[PDB]
């Protein structure tokens, strides 16, 4: 039948270039679309190609080869706001759109001054949870999910302090177990050797 294929996910570094591929096998061809879809948002139109070659639109270019049944979307000078899914779609002989399943693009920020640390946040008087924050590590670090069913660990998040033009990675871990301690919360991750663990209170 009719098929469109694109990779599930891609990860690249801020400032770099990435090429998102789309191949298609369709019954006839009346053009190929790229759409951008930020998480939780509506897809929006990026480009249309129907003859062979490369078209440029700002930092994005779109290439098509009809005889190879292939297109790429090329993103240059990657920025954090390019983190999104990219959907390819092809109009067949009867103008029906066949949609690819989308490529999720993940961008690693360039952390200029890594300062990996695990901090214990202050208890809330309204909650039984203890909360630990792993923060300021370089983007090559991966955060693993918990191996303990009563410990919860979120994936890393990039936050941007716009006033200071400062970006940082962080992940949160929490539990209400008596034996939970920030010194051991991220034991299942490979964390930088130089990670700072401030001493506990007496």
């Amino acid at each position: 039948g009719q098929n469109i294929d694109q990779p599930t996910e891609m990860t690249a570094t801020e400032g770099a270039i990435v090429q998102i591929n789309c191949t298609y096998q369709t019954s006839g061809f009346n053009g190929l679309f790229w759409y951008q879809q930020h998480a939780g948002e509506a897809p929006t139109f990026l480009s249309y190609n129907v003859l062979d070659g490369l078209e440029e639109k700002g930092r994005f270019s779109s290439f098509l080869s009809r005889s190879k049944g292939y297109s790429y979307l090329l993103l240059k000078e990657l920025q954090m706001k390019d983190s999104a899914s990219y959907l390819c779609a092809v109009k067949d002989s009867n103008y029906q759109l066949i949609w690819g399943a989308g490529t999720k693009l993940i961008i690693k920020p360039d952390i200029q001054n890594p300062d990996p640390a695990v901090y214990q946040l202050r208890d809330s008087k309204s909650s039984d949870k203890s909360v630990c924050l792993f923060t300021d590590f370089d983007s090559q670090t991966n955060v693993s999910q918990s191996k303990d069913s009563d410990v919860y660990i979120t994936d890393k998040c990039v936050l941007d302090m716009r006033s200071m033009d400062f970006k940082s990675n962080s992940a949160v871990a929490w539990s209400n177990k008596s034996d939970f301690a920030c010194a051991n919360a991220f034991n299942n991750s490979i964390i930088p050797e130089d990670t700072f663990f401030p001493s506990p209170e007496s």
């Binding site: 006839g28 061809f29 009346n30 053009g31 249309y48 129907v50 003859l51 002989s93």
Partner: peptide
């Protein structure tokens, strides 16, 4: 302009295929 490109492709490739 994209509409013109579409029509060229339709005349030269799709129409002949039909």
């Amino acid at each position: 302009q994209h509409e013109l490109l579409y029509q060229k492709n339709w005349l030269e490739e799709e129409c002949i295929a039909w």
